[PDB]
């Protein structure tokens, strides 16, 4: 479906998780800047060298795709289009 050849499953998974658990901090605490930096530092410790800004932008994208992506509720619709004068 998608291919950016930038982030690997390993890194992605690690980031997502960290963002999933810390997510709360973002809900309870207004400021996030501090949360972003924290996540990064943690990642580096694991063995993944990734800047804080990278994770931030990468996340936002994961949300846009996560939503658009299929969902439990039924209702896929007609993806394909009608061929003019088929």
From Swiss-Prot:
Post-translational modification: Phosphorylation is calcium-dependent and increases DNA-binding activity 10 to 20-fold.
Secretion signal span: none
Phosphothreonine carried by residues: 53
Transmembrane intervals: none
Listed result of changing residue 53 to D: Increases DNA-binding activity 3-fold
Compartments where found: Nucleus
Superkingdom per UniProt: Eukaryota
Residues covered by the Myb-like domain: 1-63
Function text: Probable transcription factor that binds specifically to the core DNA sequence 5'-GGTTAA-3'. May act as a molecular switch in response to light signals.
Subunit composition and interactions: Binds DNA as homodimer.
Protein name (record): Trihelix transcription factor GT-1
Organism name: Arabidopsis thaliana
